[PDB]
Each structure stands twice: as structure tokens, then as C-alpha cells.
Design an enzyme around this catalytic site. Structure first.
Site, PDB file in Angstrom:
ATOM      1  CG  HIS B 327       5.213   5.488  -1.581  1.00  0.00           C
ATOM      2  ND1 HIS B 327       5.499   6.476  -1.782  1.00  0.00           N
ATOM      3  CD2 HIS B 327       4.689   4.593  -1.736  1.00  0.00           C
ATOM      4  CE1 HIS B 327       4.544   6.366  -2.586  1.00  0.00           C
ATOM      5  NE2 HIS B 327       3.772   5.497  -2.836  1.00  0.00           N
ATOM      6  N   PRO B 328       8.509   5.564  -2.266  1.00  0.00           N
ATOM      7  CG  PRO B 328       9.021   3.900  -3.543  1.00  0.00           C
ATOM      8  CD  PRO B 328       8.140   4.026  -2.756  1.00  0.00           C
ATOM      9  CG  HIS B 356       7.491   5.871 -12.257  1.00  0.00           C
ATOM     10  ND1 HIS B 356       6.960   6.699 -11.319  1.00  0.00           N
ATOM     11  CD2 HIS B 356       6.232   5.471 -12.161  1.00  0.00           C
ATOM     12  CE1 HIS B 356       5.742   6.954 -11.322  1.00  0.00           C
ATOM     13  NE2 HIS B 356       5.256   6.588 -12.969  1.00  0.00           N
ATOM     14  CD  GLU B 357       9.021   8.357  -6.882  1.00  0.00           C
ATOM     15  OE1 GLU B 357       8.670   9.552  -7.488  1.00  0.00           O
ATOM     16  OE2 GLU B 357       8.552   7.342  -6.727  1.00  0.00           O
ATOM     17  CG  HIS B 360       7.099  11.533 -11.072  1.00  0.00           C
ATOM     18  ND1 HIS B 360       6.664  11.950 -11.830  1.00  0.00           N
ATOM     19  CD2 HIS B 360       7.087  10.370 -10.300  1.00  0.00           C
ATOM     20  CE1 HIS B 360       5.423  11.167 -11.618  1.00  0.00           C
ATOM     21  NE2 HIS B 360       5.517  10.101 -10.662  1.00  0.00           N
ATOM     22  CD  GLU B 384       1.247   9.789 -10.805  1.00  0.00           C
ATOM     23  OE1 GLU B 384       2.036   9.071 -10.674  1.00  0.00           O
ATOM     24  OE2 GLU B 384       0.642  10.917  -9.728  1.00  0.00           O
ATOM     25  CD1 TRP B 459     -19.392   0.323  -6.668  1.00  0.00           C
ATOM     26  CD2 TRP B 459     -19.671  -1.858  -5.793  1.00  0.00           C
ATOM     27  NE1 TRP B 459     -18.456  -0.181  -7.325  1.00  0.00           N
ATOM     28  CE2 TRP B 459     -18.223  -0.905  -6.166  1.00  0.00           C
ATOM     29  CE3 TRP B 459     -19.451  -2.881  -5.068  1.00  0.00           C
ATOM     30  CZ2 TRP B 459     -16.849  -1.792  -5.695  1.00  0.00           C
ATOM     31  CZ3 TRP B 459     -18.131  -3.772  -4.105  1.00  0.00           C
ATOM     32  CH2 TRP B 459     -17.521  -2.673  -5.024  1.00  0.00           C
ATOM     33  CE  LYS B 463     -16.448  -4.950  -7.427  1.00  0.00           C
ATOM     34  NZ  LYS B 463     -15.106  -4.117  -7.737  1.00  0.00           N
ATOM     35  CG  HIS B 487      -6.505   6.279  -4.626  1.00  0.00           C
ATOM     36  ND1 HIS B 487      -6.012   4.898  -4.644  1.00  0.00           N
ATOM     37  CD2 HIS B 487      -5.096   6.831  -4.997  1.00  0.00           C
ATOM     38  CE1 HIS B 487      -4.827   4.624  -4.891  1.00  0.00           C
ATOM     39  NE2 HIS B 487      -4.312   6.023  -5.258  1.00  0.00           N
ATOM     40  CE1 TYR B 497      -2.599   6.205  -9.952  1.00  0.00           C
ATOM     41  CE2 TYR B 497      -5.529   5.607  -8.690  1.00  0.00           C
ATOM     42  CZ  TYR B 497      -4.230   6.060  -8.770  1.00  0.00           C
ATOM     43  OH  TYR B 497      -3.001   6.859  -7.479  1.00  0.00           O
TER      44      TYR B 497
END
Ligand SMILES: *[C@@H]1O[C@H](CO)[C@@H](O)[C@H](O)[C@H]1NC(C)=O
Ligand SMILES: *[C@@H]1O[C@H](CO)[C@@H](O)[C@H](O)[C@H]1NC(C)=O
Ligand SMILES: *[C@@H]1O[C@H](CO)[C@@H](O)[C@H](O)[C@H]1NC(C)=O
Ligand SMILES: *[C@@H]1O[C@H](CO)[C@@H](O)[C@H](O)[C@H]1NC(C)=O
Ligand SMILES: *[C@@H]1O[C@H](CO)[C@@H](O)[C@H](O)[C@H]1NC(C)=O
Ligand SMILES: *[C@@H]1O[C@H](CO)[C@@H](O)[C@H](O)[C@H]1NC(C)=O
EC number: 3.4.17.23
Lengths: 99, 596
Positions: B327-328, B356-357, B360, B384, B459, B463, B487, B497
Site C-alpha cells: 500500500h502506498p 498524491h503521496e 502528502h 487528504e 439503515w 439507504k 474503517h 472523505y
């Protein structure tokens, strides 16, 4: 981690020029007496720089030499090297021999 | 003498001792990640235990300095961050039970293996065994089987565990003077003490609803278009008036819709903007990828990477003998040490991930001047968002033409921009109702609005109402369908997000306005603009020293999160979707019309 290098992080007053403080007395930040124990509000003054090779350029160890030049009424003896121009004979030249 | 000077000496010893213990813990974690060996695991566990015990002792010692006798904003912010009890306020038995529950949920999620009944000789794990099936299959009953079987096993294992988890986390949060665990998560956006720039925990839910009310027409049109295309793909399952079946969204949970781009493409005949073959033809190494990214960041005026970055990062897979996490991840180890751990391939995805990284890394480098406990983003969204803006800018055809990766005679017409915007909407817009519905459901669970016997009945009702996704078959209360995601099962906030998505386009509009771009927002590139980089770096240098509202004022000139840049980004696509939805019906019905 090289923990042989230390710095003072706390003192009651600022240092005077060319002063050395090697005291290892516990810093009193509060009204309460430290009594030699690193408890509440009483910290140890000298902290260490954990110098590791993978550090950034602003955190890497730098050796610093500071040269202080003073002229005092005593005879000045630390002089810089004086060159010796190749001696020329039998000609009218301007000579400077030892001043 | 005074309390403030005592706190300043304490936060001058703390920053140095914590920086040292942090660096050591982070370096142990790095050595575990690049070299999976048992001694590295032991060193990581020892460093983590020392770090946690040190944080516990400094939290115990920081509370003895009262907050109301300190007037300096930075000192009060660091003391507020340090004085949080965390789990320490809870009893030792209940804290141990909570830690055990979190660890066993981590083991259940990581080592969860599900396969078909009557064929148990081999089974497939979630990554990549079930991910590839969900992302690539076109079969209705196979996806239905994988979805129902994985939610059966994972939910039936995790439901009592989650019932204990909500009670323990609510107990800890009410022990920490919070209304619930949802208020504890919303306290990250709480700003107190600043005149005009104050933000409340209760204002976050209202702002999220206000933004989502403007999100809803675009999402309704996108849902209608995806519904029509999935009706074309699957003839009888999808109803014209009803919701989408849950197992057909292209991912395991519905987090992203990016795997439906093949089925829902507007113009398949037109080419894509794939630049992978051009790098293969020019033999672009991963080092060249990171050098091009560095060239992009120096073009905007940001500082270039250090020598220690190039020396100490792992930008290629080491080999078979040495194992590493694929994973990056960008690592700010401390003391000016910045690294990227990515197994970089020659793909467009890895190139955008490298941008992206490195975004960061630039964000981490910018607040290096700040004190240790203020070296973070102003909120969880900014960190992010500053990587996602680099992902946006690097993906533009102007950037690819500028660096030579795209042919200079490529025709940029409206159809390629429409299909690119649709792909970006499936990735970006599609995650927003799922994120909002999941966070609102978790907030109602923590708040006690929903009793434990009515968790799932509400729920699915949420939805259908919000996401427009219907269950294939009804689920009773023996299932735990939310906790199948990484998560939620591992105690992570999910609103980051949503905030990242809005802040991404707000930052994009601000930098494009700074760079004086005169076209569409999605056609904008922030390279070669020193003023845009200066406007970015003014916010970047602050870190956590200033409120996120003031940082947003520094970038976009607004005191609150805004939804209009997102709608402006997708406006050509919005008009195209409105044109394409004339015959079809926008919106959905919450009834059981497709399948139940
Ligand atoms: C990874 O760990 C193995 C374990 O013996 C060691 O031999 C090797 O040198 C390590 N490699 C790196 C790059 O740290
Ligand atoms: C707050 O403290 C920092 C150092 O801890 C200091 O540099 C700053 O000037 C202080 N702010 C005010 C308003 O006094
Ligand atoms: C942390 O817990 C202690 C006792 O457990 C309590 O006295 C203190 O007020 C708590 N701190 C906060 C910020 O709630
Ligand atoms: C970063 O830029 C400076 C000044 O432009 C340059 O001297 C330095 O060599 C660069 N760093 C690297 C790793 O190329
Ligand atoms: C793209 O532009 C051409 C010419 O202006 C037009 O005929 C076509 O309908 C447009 N397509 C879209 C999707 O706007
Ligand atoms: C930005 O600067 C680089 C370096 O001079 C240059 O090669 C590139 O073409 C510039 N970008 C544009 C869009 O001209």
C-alpha cells in the site's frame, strides 16, 4: 542513536557572552522547591540530541568552531604567515628584511 | 512562576522528548513495513508500548495545568490536545475489554475467509480474492452469493462485538464530557476561543445536510443514468422506478462506483487518455515518475525533496525474499525525515498516486517549523485534500502534454471531457451519499436515536432514502452489514472523505483563480504559477496552529465548507446528464419494485 551530545534547555537567566554553564542542578519552573527530584514542574536542564544518520539536513550534527580574535595591550604573537619573495642580488631593489 | 510559563517549559520539554520517541516509533514502524520480520514486529510493539505509555504519563501530567489561566492560543491548543483522557478515563477492565474487542475485530476483518458452501477445499480472502470478483464480474447470482455470504459471516461474527463496542465507546465519551462518540468524532472540527471563526460540533451535521441538499440533484441524475445503463447490462433485475440492487455497484460495499466506468461509458468508440503505453515506449522508471512530480512541485513554487527522501525511500518492490506492504504510504518520521513507501509500477494510477503521496510529503514538510503537537492538519479533511488537489492537477491532459507523456496532436473535444467527468463523478460524487448516510447512521446509533433492535430496519430505510440502493433480500437483526467495511470495524472516522471531497474542489477553484485559468475548472492546471503555490503555502505552513476556518479563509476566502465548487467542476457533465435524462425518470422510489 548518539546520546553523547547535550544542550541546556532551561535556565533562570540568559547567558553572558563567552560564558560556560556546566551545572546539572534541577530547573525550578514553579514556586515549589525541586528538592533534587524531577517531579511536577521541576525538569532536568540538559537534554540530548539523538543524532542518527537518517536525519534531515536541519537536524544533522554540525561541528562548529568559533574563532575569537582580540587585540590586548600585551604583545601580539599570533601572526599570519609572511611570504618570502625570491631574493634578487646586484640590482637596485626595495628590500624589506624583518620589518 | 506563573502557570503559563510553567506550561511553556512543559511544552518545550514535551516537544523534544515526544519528537525523539515519535521518530523512534515511526522508524520501527517503517522497518516493519519495508521488512516484515518477527524482530521488526517485536521492535514495533515495544516502541508502540513505550510511545503509548509516554503519552499516558504526559496526559496525566498535563491536566494539572488549568486551561482558563492560559491566554496564548497556541499553548492552549497544545494543552487541549494533550489533556484528552482518551480511553484512560474508563475503568481498566472496560478499557482492556474495548482494546480486546478492537483487536479481535481487526483479526476478524483481516483474516476473514468466505467461500461457497459444498466446495470448501479452497477459499478466497477479501483482498484480492473478493475485490476482483466484485470489480470485474458481470454475473448476478455470483455477486449476490459473494455479497450475502460475506455479510452473513462477517455480520454474524461482528454483531455482538459491535453491540459491546457502541456501549463501551459511549461510556468513554460520556466519561470525557461528550454527548456521545459521534460528538467526540465531531469535536475535531470544534473551534473555540477565536472571535468570529468559532465552529461548533452541532453545526457540522447541519452544514453536511445543507451541502448534501445541493449534492442531491446531481446524484439523482447520475443515479438515473447509472440505473439506465445497468438496466441495459442486466435486463430484468433493475426497475425503471426503483433503487439499484446492492451487489451491482462495482465494489464490495458501494464505497466507489469507479468499476462501472466500462458499463456506463458515454462514448466507447472515442479513445481514452491512457498514457501507460507512452511511458512503456519511453521506458519511464519510477525514479523518473517521482522526478517529474518533483518538477511539478518546483514549477508551482514549492520546495523540492530532500536528499534523505531520495536516499531513504523505497520506491520499488524489494523482491521475493524480502516482504513489504504494497500500500502506498507517505511517512513523516520526524526531524526532517520524509519518505514514501510505494511499490510503484508503470501505470497512470501509480503516477497519480505518486503525485498524491508527494503532496502528502509537501504538506508534512510545510509544517516542520511548527511545534511537535501542532504538526498535523487543521482538520482531518485538509491533509487528504492537499493530496487530492495534486491528483486532480496531475491527471489533466495539459499536464500530460506539458511533460511529453501525451501526443501534442491529441484532439480535446467535448466527448472525452464528458466521459472523463463521468468517471470522476463515479469516483468522487458517488462516494458522497454513502459517506453521509454511514456517518449519519453512526451518529444516530451513538446518540441513541435508534434502538438496538431497530438498527437495520432504519439503515436500509436510510439507504433507500439517501443512497438509492435497495437490499436484494431483507436482513434481520442477526446481520451486521455496516461493520464489513475497514474503517467502521477498526474505529475510524468516516466524515474525512466528505470533507476532503468538498475541500478538494474548493482548493481547486481557489488555486485556479489564483493561477488565472480562463477555461473550465476540470481543464485547469496549476503548474508554472508561483502565486498559486504561495497561496497554498501560506495555509500549508500553518499546520494545526490556526483554526481550519481561518485556513479556509486564507485559501478560498470563505469561513465555511462550500458545495458550489464541486457543482461548478461537474457542470458540463451536469448539463449532459440533464439532456440524457429527458426520457428516463430522475429520482428513485423507496418501494420494493426492483427486487426484494
Ligand atoms: C530485511 O530483513 C532481513 C532479515 O534477516 C535482513 O537480512 C535484510 O538485510 C533486511 N533488508 C533490509 C533492506 O532492511
Ligand atoms: C505563544 O507562544 C509562542 C511560543 O510558545 C510564542 O512564540 C508566541 O508569540 C505566543 N503568542 C502570543 C500571542 O504571545
Ligand atoms: C481526565 O480524567 C481525570 C480523571 O480520570 C479527570 O479529573 C479530568 O478532568 C479528565 N480530563 C478531561 C479533559 O476530561
Ligand atoms: C533542490 O533545489 C536546490 C535549489 O534549486 C538545489 O540546490 C538542490 O540540489 C535541489 N535538491 C535536489 C535533491 O536536487
Ligand atoms: C460536441 O460538439 C459538437 C460540435 O460542437 C456537437 O455536434 C456535439 O453534439 C457535442 N457533444 C456534446 C456531448 O456536447
Ligand atoms: C512549466 O515550466 C516547465 C519548465 O520550464 C516547462 O517545461 C513547461 O512547459 C511549463 N508549462 C507550460 C504549460 O508551459
Amino acid at each position: 542513536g548518539n546520546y553523547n551530545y547535550l544542550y541546556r534547555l532551561f535556565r533562570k537567566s540568559n547567558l553572558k557572552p563567552f560564558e560556560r554553564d556546566i551545572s546539572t542542578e534541577i530547573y525550578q519552573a514553579g514556586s515549589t522547591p525541586c528538592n533534587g527530584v524531577k517531579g511536577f514542574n521541576c525538569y532536568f536542564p540538559l537534554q540530548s540530541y539523538g543524532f542518527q544518520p537518517t536525519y534531515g539536513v536541519g537536524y544533522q550534527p554540525y561541528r562548529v568552531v568559533v574563532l575569537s580574535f582580540e587585540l590586548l595591550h600585551a604583545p601580539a604573537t599570533v601572526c599570519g604567515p609572511k611570504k618570502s619573495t625570491n631574493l634578487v642580488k646586484n640590482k637596485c631593489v626595495n628590500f624589506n628584511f624583518n620589518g | 512562576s506563573t502557570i503559563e510559563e510553567q506550561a511553556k517549559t512543559f511544552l518545550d520539554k514535551f516537544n523534544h522528548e515526544a519528537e525523539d520517541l515519535f521518530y523512534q516509533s515511526s522508524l520501527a514502524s517503517w522497518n516493519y513495513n519495508t521488512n516484515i520480520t518477527e524482530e521488526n514486529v517485536q521492535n514495533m510493539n515495544n516502541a508502540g508500548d513505550k510511545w503509548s505509555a509516554f503519552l499516558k504519563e504526559q496526559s496525566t501530567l498535563a491536566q494539572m495545568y488549568p486551561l482558563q489561566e492560559i491566554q496564548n492560543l497556541t499553548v492552549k491548543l497544545q494543552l487541549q490536545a494533550l489533556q484528552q483522557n482518551g480511553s484512560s478515563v474508563l475503568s481498566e477492565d472496560k478499557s482492556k475489554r474495548l482494546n480486546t474487542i478492537l483487536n479481535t475485530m481487526s483479526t476478524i476483518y483481516s483474516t476473514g475467509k468466505v467461500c461457497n458452501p459444498d466446495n470448501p477445499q479452497e477459499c478466497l480472502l477479501l483482498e484480492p480474492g473478493l475485490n476482483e470478483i466484485m470489480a470485474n464480474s458481470l454475473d448476478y447470482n455470483e455477486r449476490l452469493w459473494a455479497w450475502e455470504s460475506w455479510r452473513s459471516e462477517v455480520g454474524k461474527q461482528l454483531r455482538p462485538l459491535y453491540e459491546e463496542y457502541v456501549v463501551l465507546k459511549n461510556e468513554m465519551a460520556r466519561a470525557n464530557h461528550y454527548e456521545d462518540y459521534g460528538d467526540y468524532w465531531r469535536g475535531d472540527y470544534e473551534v473555540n476561543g477565536v472571535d468570529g471563526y468559532d465552529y461548533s460540533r452541532g453545526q457540522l451535521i447541519e452544514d453536511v445536510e445543507h451541502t448534501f441538499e445541493e449534492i442531491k440533484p446531481l446524484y439523482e441524475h447520475l443515479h438515473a443514468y447509472v440505473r439506465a445503463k445497468l438496466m441495459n447490462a442486466y435486463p430484468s433485475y433493475i426497475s425503471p422506478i426503483g433503487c439499484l440492487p446492492a451487489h451491482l455497484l462495482g465494489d464490495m460495499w458501494g464505497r466507489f462506483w469507479t468499476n462501472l466506468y466500462s458499463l456506463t461509458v458515454p462514448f466507447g468508440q472515442k479513445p481514452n487518455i491512457d498514457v501507460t503505453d507512452a511511458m512503456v515506449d519511453q521506458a519511464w522508471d519510477a525514479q523518473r515518475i517521482f522526478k517529474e512530480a518533483e518538477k511539478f512541485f518546483v514549477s508551482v513554487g514549492l520546495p523540492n525533496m530532500t536528499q534523505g527522501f531520495w536516499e531513504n525511500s523505497m520506491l520499488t518492490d524489494p523482491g521475493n525474499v524480502q516482504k513489504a506492504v504494497c500500500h502506498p504510504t507517505a511517512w513523516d518520521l520526524g526531524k526532517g525525515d520524509f519518505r514514501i513507501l510505494m511499490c510503484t509500477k508503470v501505470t497512470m494510477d501509480d503516477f497519480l498516486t505518486a503525485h498524491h503521496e508527494m503532496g502528502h510529503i509537501q504538506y508534512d514538510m510545510a509544517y516542520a517549523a511548527q511545534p511537535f503537537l501542532l504538526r498535523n492538519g487543521a482538520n482531518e479533511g485538509f491533509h487528504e485534500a492537499v493530496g487530492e488537489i495534486m491528483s486532480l492537477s496531475a491527471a489533466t491532459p495539459k499536464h500530460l502534454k506539458s511533460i511529453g507523456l501525451l501526443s501534442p496532436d491529441f484532439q480535446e473535444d467535448n466527448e472525452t471531457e464528458i466521459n472523463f467527468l463521468l468517471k470522476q463523478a463515479l469516483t468522487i460524487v458517488g462516494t458522497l451519499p454513502f459517506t453521509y448516510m454511514l456517518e449519519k447512521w453512526r451518529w444516530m446509533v451513538f446518540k441513541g436515536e435508534i434502538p438496538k433492535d431497530q438498527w437495520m430496519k432504519k439503515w436500509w430505510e436510510m439507504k433507500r432514502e439517501i443512497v438509492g440502493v435497495v437490499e436484494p433480500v431483507p436482513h434481520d437483526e442477526t446481520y451486521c452489514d455496516p461493520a464489513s467495511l475497514f474503517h467502521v470495524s477498526n474505529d475510524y472516522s468516516f466524515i474525512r472523505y466528505y470533507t476532503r471531497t468538498l475541500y478538494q474542489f474548493q482548493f481547486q477553484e481557489a488555486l485556479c483563480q489564483a493561477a488565472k485559468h480562463e477555461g473550465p475548472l476540470h481543464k485547469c492546471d496549476i503548474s508554472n504559477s508561483t502565486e498559486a503555490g504561495q497561496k497554498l503555502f501560506n495555509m500549508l505552513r500553518l499546520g494545526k496552529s490556526e483554526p481550519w476556518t481561518l485556513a479556509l479563509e486564507n485559501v478560498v476566502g470563505a469561513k465555511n465548507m462550500n458545495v458550489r465548487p464541486l457543482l461548478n467542476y461537474f457542470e458540463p457533465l451536469f448539463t449532459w446528464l440533464k439532456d440524457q435524462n429527458k426520457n428516463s425518470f430522475v429520482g428513485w422510489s423507496t418501494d420494493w419494485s426492483p427486487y426484494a
